[PDB]
Ligand binder design. Structure first.
Ligand SMILES: [Mg+2]
Ligand SMILES: [Mg+2]
Ligand SMILES: [Mg+2]
Ligand SMILES: [Mg+2]
Ligand SMILES: [Mg+2]
Ligand SMILES: [Mg+2]
Ligand SMILES: [Mg+2]
Ligand SMILES: [Mg+2]
Ligand SMILES: [Mg+2]
Ligand SMILES: [Mg+2]
Lengths: 58, 134, 205, 113, 108
RNA sequence: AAGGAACUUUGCAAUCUCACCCCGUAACUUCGGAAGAAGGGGUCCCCACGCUUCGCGUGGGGCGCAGUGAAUAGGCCCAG
RNA sequence: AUUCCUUGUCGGGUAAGUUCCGACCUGCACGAAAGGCGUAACGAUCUGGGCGCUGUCUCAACGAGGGACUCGGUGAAAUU
RNA sequence: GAUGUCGGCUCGUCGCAUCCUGGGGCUGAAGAAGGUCCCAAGGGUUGGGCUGUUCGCCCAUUAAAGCGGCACGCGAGCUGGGUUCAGAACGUCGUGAGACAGUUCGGUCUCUAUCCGCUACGGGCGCAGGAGAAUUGAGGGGAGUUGCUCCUAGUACGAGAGGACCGGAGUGAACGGACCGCUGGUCUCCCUGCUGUCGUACCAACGGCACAUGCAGGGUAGCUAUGUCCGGAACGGAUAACCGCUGAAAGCAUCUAAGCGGGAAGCCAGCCCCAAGAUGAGUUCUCCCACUGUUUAUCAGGUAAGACUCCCGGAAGACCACCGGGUUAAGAGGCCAGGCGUGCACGCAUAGCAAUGUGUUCAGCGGACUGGUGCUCAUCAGUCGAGGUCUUGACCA
């Protein structure tokens, strides 16, 4: 049938013992020099569409 | 390289046209006759190595015959021998020379060039019937 | 004892008399002496030597200082050698000498995660007369209820390579001082451009 | 190891189809948006292509005809865009990354002439 | 690993031209390598393999050439290091007309 | 690469053969067959010449490692 | 394919054969329509052998694609 | 309410009542070759033919070609030949349905590892300031095989035939590590050649599809073996068997009770590798420094030295990690030069009825290789990160 299978239910604790590594790091947002919303380092500022000049369209 | 089940051509009028390998001895020509094995393994016969063999084809009329079990010395491997200058040799087919417990060609002469390797191997007489020693 | 640092540059052909010879070209670049250690200072006897040069605009304020304590010039690579000495700096000139046997050590090329056929040789199996274990896969890990577990060390797939390797008694063919170049017979481990440490033979006949 | 030097995700005939395909777009629109990576793979291929176009003679043209199956496009690269890059050491095409995407969460990008 | 500034490329040349030799041109078509077989006892022989070149693999110290031939009934291929000290001198014998750097097909 | 059934319960599996012309083809047989037995050759292009035309034959020329030039596409035999 | 003692004995073939072929016969417990013995041709039939080729093997190796890995979307199971 | 069975394949590891190597006593041990008993498990212990075999017989070798154990080691590892399903057959037993000491051909062996165990790789915290880098080695692993030939020496020995110890030299086998210069293998679009078809109007030139490279030929880097290079050691310490000096108890004899020495492939050390989570958390060199916050926000908050984040990459890699660069820039790409591979391009010209040949052309094309070069992008900028307990003692003016 299902050859391997687990021998006992896992501790609500043990469950967690592992999950001690699923915490998302959050973006390191930076502030634009030009529209000042927060941009994502090394990409075009979503809001004003800049990267020294205006690349993407507004 | 040569190994058991590996049919060679006979480069001598020994009478045996084609021989299948049976075992790769660790070619012992030296001292009195042929010295004895240098290990019970060694898997490949290289020009100048001695093998044991079972004659699978002899011509009608000749010392050696079909089904005979003989000793031969590998003179032409289609593998590649590599000399100290750094050159390389390789013949279209593998051929040996049926011989005796003194390492002397059972035949009255060799056929086809033979590995100069046989010379350092001290297999002098063989060399001596060799039409060439590339 | 005696020893030096260098970079593996490549292999090539060279004849000596009439014997073609594969050689590996090491650049035992010159080596600064940045720190002497005595049992009376560091518990033991050794020497700190250096190697690839490094731009000062890339040197930690701390490292700078260490390096200053012996006006040398940020190297980027340091390594100690035991029972060694000399004054000034370490160069192969008068160190190694054509003929000597040496132990070029370096870091093996890195083969990532490798199965057992390729890392311990194993043999896997049948590739035709029935399977799912075709070629690689180790067979059985052990035995039964007894030693109901596997042994501390059974050979299995791991990260192969990326190791420290030493190779012994390699002939020092040609030495071209003042190019801190040195051809060594045979091959040394580690990819071209890697660090390599040539030393007197650790154990020579 | 795997110490080679290229990129796929599809087969042999495909990576080709792509490069050529995007190659065309970019050359036809001076800037297309695509997956960050699909860009990077494209960058050089299109650049090499321009350096070919950058020779004028029928030859250099017909070489380009092998990666541009759209006459109009080829003519552009050949007589309009190649001639212009005349004075620069080849090396023009920049990538600009944008936001991450919703559908797949894949970070999209800009590749412009 | 050690990131010294260096042209690994040349360091090698400089330790390779001291072991590199030029020879006649040839490309295929017959050749005759008159090489010395110094290995018989102390006596220094002199052999002359000759015939169809079938490949010019490599460069520098490593450059070499392969020549096929049929000696006394059985085909033979020799391989020579342009700087193999075992070679006195090579010579064209008669330029051939083929159309591909190899010839392997000639083994038949 | 070299070797070539050494695998192994067993050449299982996977190669090889693989179309169409032509030459050729055994024991044994209820004469039908065994037979596509086995084996060997050919096979593209151009030109001239004749043929029953699609096509084909003869001769000469040509190109490549190779011409059912890529897909479809028998491995054969001995004995029980 | 009916043999136990049994790999019977001799011969064949193989370098070497508990199998296969042929004889012998001492048929544990063959035998004439529960058919006897033989037989060309037929067999995805079962057995032994040979030629050919081969990654079956000596030994593996490189390459490819699909998974396996990683991020975003959805998100089971047997077991306990 | 299930501990899967014979054999094999794979992977091992252990005992010794040791098969071979190593040390020895005795020999009916001349030498050479043996027998035998004791010490000794470091390492090693071939490939085939027949059989489902284990066994065993045989071919050909070998230093040897050991015996057992581990659920007759190992099927959540594979096979599935053997045997304890259903089909069929023969012999035999049964009047039968059926049966068997038997023999014969056939016959589905279940993707998804929780826990322990194992191999690899990270995260956290700790190691009493915060950091950069260099180490000691507590301890632990790997390795630990052997032939043949030469010299000594044709000596010792032996009537002779034959023919050494010891010591010293070479050179193989198998095994393992590293490596890619070589010889080769691959190189899935680097170059070329070829067919059919569809397309780019047509001709000419090209593209697609004929695998998931249409096929063929070749092939850099890389990776790789049947290719290279190196290794198993020396010396040493303590020992086994064994052998000995001095030597009483037995005014003698005695390797022994005092004492002492020699002595094995084995033990420990030495060789290569790991190693301070050796929480008993070690050592060294260098750097940053002692800030701020009213018994209302009691501690965190700026920050230093330093590092991360991110981007561009890598001979590093599943992920992480590790290394390099990130404009004070040569990091990667491109671009230029060169290298190497393919093997002569498109076009035009000329020759030919044509097919094609020849010339311009050692052309043309161009992954991964060597350098160069500021053309592209490594913008901007955010986050984190010390002010160092106490006790005794020693030193300072
Ligand atoms: Mg295998
Ligand atoms: Mg080659
Ligand atoms: Mg019969
Ligand atoms: Mg003894
Ligand atoms: Mg089990
Ligand atoms: Mg190569
Ligand atoms: Mg190909
Ligand atoms: Mg002692
Ligand atoms: Mg990555
Ligand atoms: Mg950095």
């Amino acid at each position: 049938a299902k050859h391997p299978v687990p021998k006992k239910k896992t501790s609500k604790s043990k469950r967690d013992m592992r999950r001690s590594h699923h915490a998302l790091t959050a973006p390191n947002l930076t502030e634009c020099p030009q529209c000042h919303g927060k941009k994502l380092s090394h990409h075009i500022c979503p809001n004003c569409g800049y990267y020294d000049g205006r690349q993407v369209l507004a | 390289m040569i190994m058991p089940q590996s049919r060679l051509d006979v480069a001598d009028n020994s009478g045996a046209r084609e021989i299948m390998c049976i075992r790769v001895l660790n070619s012992g020509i030296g001292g009195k006759g042929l010295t004895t094995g240098g290990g019970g393994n060694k898997r490949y016969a290289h020009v100048g190595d001695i093998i044991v063999a079972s004659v699978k084809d002899a011509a009608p009329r000749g010392a050696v015959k079909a089904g005979d079990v003989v000793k031969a010395v590998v003179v032409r491997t289609s593998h590649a021998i590599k000399r100290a200058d750094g050159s390389t040799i390789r013949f279209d087919r593998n051929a040996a020379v049926i011989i005796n417990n003194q390492g002397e060609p059972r035949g009255t002469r060799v056929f086809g060039p033979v590995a100069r390797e046989l010379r350092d191997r001290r297999f002098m007489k063989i060399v001596s019937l060799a039409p060439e020693v590339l | 004892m005696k020893g030096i640092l260098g970079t593996k540059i490549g292999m090539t052909q060279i004849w000596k008399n009439d014997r073609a010879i594969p050689v590996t070209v090491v650049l035992a670049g010159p080596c600064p002496i940045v720190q002497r250690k005595t049992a009376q200072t560091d518990g033991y006897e050794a020497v700190q030597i250096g190697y690839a040069p490094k731009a000062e605009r890339k040197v930690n304020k701390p490292m700078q200082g260490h390096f200053a304590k012996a006006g040398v010039a940020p190297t980027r690579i340091l390594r100690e050698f035991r029972g060694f000495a000399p004054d000034g700096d370490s160069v192969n000139v008068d160190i190694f000498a054509e003929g000597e046997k040496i132990d070029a050590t370096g870091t093996s090329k890195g083969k990532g995660t490798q199965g057992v056929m390729k890392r311990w040789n194993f043999a896997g199996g049948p590739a035709s007369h029935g399977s799912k274990k075709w070629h690689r896969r180790p067979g059985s890990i052990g035995q039964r209820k007894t030693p109901g577990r596997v042994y501390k060390g059974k050979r299995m797939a791991g990260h192969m390579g990326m190791e420290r390797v030493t190779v012994q008694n390699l002939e020092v063919v040609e030495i071209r001082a003042g190019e801190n170049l040195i051809l060594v017979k045979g091959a040394i481990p580690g990819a071209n451009g890697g660090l390599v440490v040539l030393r007197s033979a650790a154990k020579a006949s | 190891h795997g110490k080679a030097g290229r990129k796929l995700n599809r087969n042999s005939s495909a990576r080709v189809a792509l490069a050529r395909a995007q190659a065309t777009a970019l050359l036809r629109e001076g800037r297309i948006q695509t997956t960050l990576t699909k860009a990077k793979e494209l960058r050089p291929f299109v650049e090499q292509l321009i350096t070919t176009a950058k020779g004028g003679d029928l030859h250099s043209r017909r070489l380009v005809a092998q990666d541009i199956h759209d006459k109009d496009v080829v003519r552009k690269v050949m007589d309009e865009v190649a001639p212009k890059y005349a004075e620069r050491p080849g090396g023009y095409t920049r990538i600009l990354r944008v936001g991450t995407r919703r559908g797949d969460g894949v970070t999209m990008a800009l590749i412009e002439l | 690993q050690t990131h010294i500034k260096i042209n690994r490329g040349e360091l090698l040349r400089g330790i390779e031209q001291d072991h590199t030799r030029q020879l006649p041109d040839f490309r295929p078509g017959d050749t005759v390598r008159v090489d010395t077989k110094v290995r018989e006892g102390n006596r220094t022989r002199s052999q002359a393999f000759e015939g169809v070149v079938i490949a010019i693999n490599g460069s520098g110290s490593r450059k070499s050439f392969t020549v096929r031939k049929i000696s006394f009934g059985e085909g033979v291929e020799r391989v020579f290091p342009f700087a193999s000290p075992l070679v006195n001198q090579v010579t064209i014998v008669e330029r051939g007309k083929v159309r591909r750097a190899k010839l392997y097909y000639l083994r038949e």
